[PDB]
Amino acid sequence: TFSQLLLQWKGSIYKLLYSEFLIFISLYFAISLVYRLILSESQRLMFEKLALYCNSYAELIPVSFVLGFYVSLVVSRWWAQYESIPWPDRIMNLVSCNVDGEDEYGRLLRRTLMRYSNLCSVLILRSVSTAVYKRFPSMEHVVRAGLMTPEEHKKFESLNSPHNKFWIPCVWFSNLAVKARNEGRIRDSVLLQGILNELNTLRSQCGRLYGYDWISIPLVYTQVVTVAVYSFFLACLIGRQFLDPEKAYPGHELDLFVPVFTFLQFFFYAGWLKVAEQLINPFGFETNWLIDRNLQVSLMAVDEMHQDLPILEKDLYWN
Amino acid sequence: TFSQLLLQWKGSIYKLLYSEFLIFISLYFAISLVYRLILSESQRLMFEKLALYCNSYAELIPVSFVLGFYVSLVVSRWWAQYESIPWPDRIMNLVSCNVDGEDEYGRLLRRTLMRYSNLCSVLILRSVSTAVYKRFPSMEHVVRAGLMTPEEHKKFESLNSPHNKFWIPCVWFSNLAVKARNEGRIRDSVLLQGILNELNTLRSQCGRLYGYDWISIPLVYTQVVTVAVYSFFLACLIGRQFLDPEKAYPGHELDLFVPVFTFLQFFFYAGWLKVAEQLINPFGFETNWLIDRNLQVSLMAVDEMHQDLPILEKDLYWN
Amino acid sequence: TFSQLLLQWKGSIYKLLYSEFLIFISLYFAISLVYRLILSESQRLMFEKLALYCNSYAELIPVSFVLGFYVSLVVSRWWAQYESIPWPDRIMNLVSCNVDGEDEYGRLLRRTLMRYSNLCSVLILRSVSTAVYKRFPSMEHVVRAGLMTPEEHKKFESLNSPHNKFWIPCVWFSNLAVKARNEGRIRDSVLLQGILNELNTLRSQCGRLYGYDWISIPLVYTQVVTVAVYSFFLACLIGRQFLDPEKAYPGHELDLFVPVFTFLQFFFYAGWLKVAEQLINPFGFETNWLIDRNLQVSLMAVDEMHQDLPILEKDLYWN
Amino acid sequence: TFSQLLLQWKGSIYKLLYSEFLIFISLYFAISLVYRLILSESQRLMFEKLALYCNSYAELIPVSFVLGFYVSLVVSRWWAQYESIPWPDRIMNLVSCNVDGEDEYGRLLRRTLMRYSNLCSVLILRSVSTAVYKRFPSMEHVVRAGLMTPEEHKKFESLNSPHNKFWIPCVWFSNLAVKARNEGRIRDSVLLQGILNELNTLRSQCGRLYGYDWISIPLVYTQVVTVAVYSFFLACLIGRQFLDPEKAYPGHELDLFVPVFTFLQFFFYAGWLKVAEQLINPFGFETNWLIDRNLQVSLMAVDEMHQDLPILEKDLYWN
Amino acid sequence: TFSQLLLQWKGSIYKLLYSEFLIFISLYFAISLVYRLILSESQRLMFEKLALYCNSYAELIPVSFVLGFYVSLVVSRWWAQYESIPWPDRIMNLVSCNVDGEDEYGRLLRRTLMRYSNLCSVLILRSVSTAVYKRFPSMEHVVRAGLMTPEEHKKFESLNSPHNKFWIPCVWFSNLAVKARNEGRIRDSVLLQGILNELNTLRSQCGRLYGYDWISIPLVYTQVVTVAVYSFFLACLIGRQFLDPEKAYPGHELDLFVPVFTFLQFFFYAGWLKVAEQLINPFGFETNWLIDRNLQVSLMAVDEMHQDLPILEKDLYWN
């Protein structure tokens, strides 16, 4: 199963390492052809004493430390951001059953509550993602996709605040469910409070995405691991050359014109640096798909599925 | 205890590494017999300078880094997927006691609720597993096993959605428990809300299996660790040869016809790569057993065990 | 404090490594005496070229990787199993106060509830432990210790299920607390539901021990780390010999008749493999003590301590 | 994306390593010029035998261990402190809806509750941060920013306690919400208890910041990793010198006047020590911004947004 | 900031490593003076062949593995024990408001409840700490500090149990709050159950300290890492000697009379073993301070702060 995953291209390592590899191939053979064709005899001698100096400081081992601890923090943080995505499904199961009414008003009342829950999720995704920000560059594009009505857009800007306004529909939700309770649509206080708790569960997950994006991996700690990988390949552009074996240096007794086991270390060390680079901004998760799923499912379960059940009949294991 | 676990075959390392080992044995002795029998005297000399080149780039240590951090992420993620399995037992203890009625209707009413809870678990297991998907290739096979009645199958397809419909029975559950409350079968709002919370507990565990399967370990990070293991064994097909000791190379002063301590490194490095490969798709967990347990226990505890208790008598420690 | 913990014997490393060490001492000096006394002069020469071959493949470093990542997964999983032990103390504090009645019936009613909670814990401990399984080999031994009355034993076998029946008393609990509520012993629905939630808290902890035991560390991943430790000591039975220093091999210029710094590596590498071996089955935790504590405390707090409090008098800090 | 993050200055590694680098450059070339210009011929010989001694104890590898495990504990603890920040948004959604009243009193009553919640967060941030402590050096500065009224300041000092008084407004909150319930402003006990639970959720997050600051990474464990980095660079001020290549030492056959691959190890090892140093006091998080956001949003959502909703009209997906 | 933390003494590494260092200095120069002054010429020769044998088995790298994984488990477990400390503040906010009454009885009733909560925390701290056990050697010392009245001391010993009796006041709490509810002091069942849940939250944190102390890091795993550190310094007492450079051994061409870079490895390896040793018994946390804080704050907030609030006046941001 791992033996066949090398041959895939889309989303693989070769599409991602296609540009940095051809730079490394170009800077390798250019230095080699200067040594092989251009430089004079004593100038070949000055290069060989420099390549032996560069070949010692390419210790493979302390580069493998800093890539291991860095990437393991990136992937761990990447898993926490997916667990912090607001799924509307817990509010959806309570709005669909405890907000009573099957007339025009109570149907409109349920559809407004689930449209506030998704709006409290879109307005944080368009600040932490670049794909959702390209889908909704302004607030008018949110109105065009029907997440926000033209009456809610005007109220959204009279509320004047210099901060991120993702918390606006999560206060509109709880004020509408109390207004729904005081008209008889929600029966009890216990059922009202159960709806208000799953709001604050989703309020807190939108408050984690608001925190993981703004507080990233430290920029100084990114820059350490990129120097040490580029420093390793810096010495390998000089140290891993094939010299002339006539001068009997230790470890250069065969010319091969191409370092096979050095270019495989490029797809190891630089490829394990591109792991952390692809995951440090994981929103450029199909989040345009994610919004289309959550909006379509939520409005479905509270409008087409409110108190209309299949017929209760006996199953196959009846006694 | 660890001393005797080497000799087991079923589920061991030797059943899993039987094919990749005989390829490695075949590619080893074939290269050796070309050096020993076919190649001429100067052609033996060109091989020996290539084997000394290959023997240096087989550094054992930076391969052991990338297998350690990779497999430790695989096993950690493997443990989270087992903790995310929906057990019906928490809903089962509340449906069996608070959904009152011992006539034909209330018995049918309890058995429908626990059959929706298992159906909200099967429809996510047949998307994350290949064994359950072979057990239920279509939705008609779910009806044949009695998880879904022929009235619920027709309602399940009138609900039109281009997404995974595992959320359908978790909305049918909460709408039936509210209908059960408004006929007098559930007594209070506090007992109704307690049933609706354990639904959303199981709704969230089905929503983790929906996430761990679709969002896997990154494909680029799989492909790094498989190059570096196969690159290590690539140099060992050339570097670990037994040369002629007459030419006095350092570390080749004895012919043995079989590298014992290299083939043990195959069962170390390739065997510690097969650990992550067996765990990255752990559903191909006896999940056909798991569904048969959860369905049989849930229907048992709400139908044979509703309010029929053993006789209250004094225990052994009575004063 | 660490300086004195070497000298302890009970539960130490020397009681655990007493058998594997004397095998390693025996296989060492036997190979040495063949080289020193039995083999001829050319046969001494063939051994010395084999010991130089074995001494290179005993790289200490890539063995220390696979023991570090393996044992750190074992100890982490070992800590999760202790946090998953059902303590009855949360149910005990609610049964002792909200299940009213001080006559013969309500006293019997409280003692039955806490005896179901411990029985829902014993029946999972006798499947995950070998010590509790030796304490209770059958179900009749559970009746002899008074956990199960002879009326509950007959009901326990009329309930026919091919699976583990630890879930039986956790359904008996919730059906008895509803019967207690409908006789006036529990006052309200809010107090009933609070008792039924701490049942499902303990139901879920018994459902983790049901999962950590059946789903272990993978058998292929155990077998990797035991080959690599035994392969390391395999080369050290040949490579770490003291040769004749007259032939001037590099690193053999002194005979000592006993490798002190190799036998210390046995108590390092094999001793750090016995860490994971002692922890991978941690039930062979004083779980016979644990059951005796939980049963005695639970029946105490609901029978001797129900609504009988010390006298309310003023403390030392009164104003 | 990682290729361009090297060139940034603000918040990068070069602003942080500007002072320690020029000390290291100064102590390098000063020792070199003493060897090159000042010392006599035999005194050059005594230095060269000292530089060969220093060059062996600069093992790069066991320094990379202790920096990896240390920094990974620092960054993990740094992520826990951001998850422990009290956001007022969960209390804000319940105070804005369940504390009824639109007259002068109930508007004043809501604004007092959210001003106690922020005050229970500021008084712990001015003990764990130095930026908030510079913003509020005394308690009078808290009154000047309007967090505390001049009547609450006098009560705050009559309460005499030798400890940190951050727990004072979290007891004032719960006593005011009970007084609000007993005047009819909060309707039920279920809605009162829901407000009192989100207080204790925020009480516990303020109790984590009270614990992460006082209980830090151990001072002995900080001092280990700083010796080992400074010891590594101590040997490199002697060992990494360019000697005279006329005396044919192994690894000194070329003069370069500047160690390029040693100064890159300064920006690797010392730069990966400055990662943990910047994160071990992460409050010197824009916490002056954080207080200005939370105070302005909380008073907004309970005063301008209490029960004043946009007009319920049909969305774009109406049928 | 890290540059100045070397110079501190109190709580540093030098106070902790003052005894083990002077032993290591004494055993070093004693062996050196035997080689330099006492032993004869051939006896100097037998030492030099032993020091070359000892210098190879002091591989720095596989000692750094076992200290890294061990200490990272110690510090992780050390952080969990601080998060498991029972703070009384969540019970304190509910007892201070929902236990009504301002006369002599209800004031006495509140002060008894918070004195049971601290007593359920002290009786577990005097079993897991040695400082609290020295503060309270018996149960009579608990009465002298006013935690337990002389009426509660007599009831505490009539309850006969061979186990740790820390669970006694956590059952007295819940029985007193039910007695307070049935006299009209607590209003509703919802407010009673909210007090009984924060008891079981604190009951579970006292049940973690009861578990982290009794179930420690395994004794076999402590003893591994202490052999391997002491074995490393064992070879360094022989291998790191300065020999006579007249005999031209590789790596001994300069006498220095003091190994500077070996004694720095003592403050690295032994100092990183003292990290885990100081943290494995972290109670010998200012827990005498902790009890004095929690008792004084809890009795304060329920007696001086019950329903006596500051005057509601308008803040600075009024409109």
Side-chain angles (χ1 to χ4, degrees), chain A residues 1-3 5 89-90 308, chain B residues 200 203-204 223 230 277:
Chain A
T1 303
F2 282 178
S3 298
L5 285 171
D89 296 333
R90 293 171 64 96
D308 190 72
Chain B
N200 290 324
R203 178 64 190 84
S204 298
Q223 289 174 355
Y230 289 161
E277 187 171 2

Side-chain angles (χ1 to χ4, degrees), chain C residues 308-313, chain E residues 116 149 151-152 155 172 176 179:
Chain C
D308 190 72
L309 284 90
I311 299 97
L312 296 178
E313 294 183 357
Chain E
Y116 285 153
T149 63
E151 289 294 327
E152 293 172 355
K155 183 67 73 175
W172 281 342
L176 188 58
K179 188 175 182 179

Side-chain angles (χ1 to χ4, degrees), chain D residues 155 200 203-204 223 230 277, chain E residues 1-2 5 89-90 308:
Chain D
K155 183 67 73 175
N200 290 324
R203 178 64 190 84
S204 298
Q223 289 174 355
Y230 289 161
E277 187 171 2
Chain E
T1 303
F2 282 178
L5 285 171
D89 296 333
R90 293 171 64 96
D308 190 72

Side-chain angles (χ1 to χ4, degrees), chain D residues 89-235:
Chain D
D89 296 333
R90 293 171 64 96
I91 309 173
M92 181 180 73
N93 300 327
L94 296 174
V95 171
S96 176
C97 66
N98 286 322
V99 185
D100 288 326
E102 292 85 5
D103 55 350
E104 186 175 0
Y105 180 74
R107 185 182 178 185
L108 183 64
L109 181 61
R110 287 190 295 271
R111 291 183 63 88
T112 308
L113 287 174
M114 295 309 294
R115 190 172 54 81
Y116 285 153
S117 300
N118 295 316
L119 186 60
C120 197
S121 301
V122 171
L123 294 179
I124 191 60
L125 281 173
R126 66 182 296 273
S127 298
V128 308
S129 176
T130 65
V132 182
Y133 183 74
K134 286 184 179 182
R135 183 176 176 177
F136 303 109
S138 67
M139 197 58 65
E140 189 184 3
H141 293 88
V142 175
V143 183
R144 294 187 181 97
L147 289 169
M148 189 184 288
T149 63
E151 289 294 327
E152 293 172 355
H153 191 199
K154 188 183 288 185
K155 183 67 73 175
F156 190 79
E157 293 181 354
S158 67
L159 298 173
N160 197 2
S161 179
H163 304 285
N164 193 358
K165 295 181 182 68
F166 70 100
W167 59 271
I168 301 290
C170 280
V171 180
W172 281 342
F173 188 89
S174 64
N175 283 309
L176 188 58
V178 171
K179 188 175 182 179
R181 187 261 176 92
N182 295 322
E183 292 179 352
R185 299 289 185 183
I186 296 173
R187 187 176 300 276
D188 290 331
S189 64
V190 187
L191 304 175
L192 174 63
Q193 181 62 42
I195 298 171
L196 296 182
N197 292 327
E198 298 296 329
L199 179 68
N200 290 324
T201 301
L202 184 140
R203 178 64 190 84
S204 298
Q205 292 173 355
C206 297
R208 292 186 183 96
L209 289 176
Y210 184 66
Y212 288 113
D213 183 75
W214 176 57
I215 299 302
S216 297
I217 301 160
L219 178 57
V220 60
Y221 187 54
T222 293
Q223 289 174 355
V224 171
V225 315
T226 59
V227 169
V229 170
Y230 289 161
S231 299
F232 181 78
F233 294 151
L234 183 64

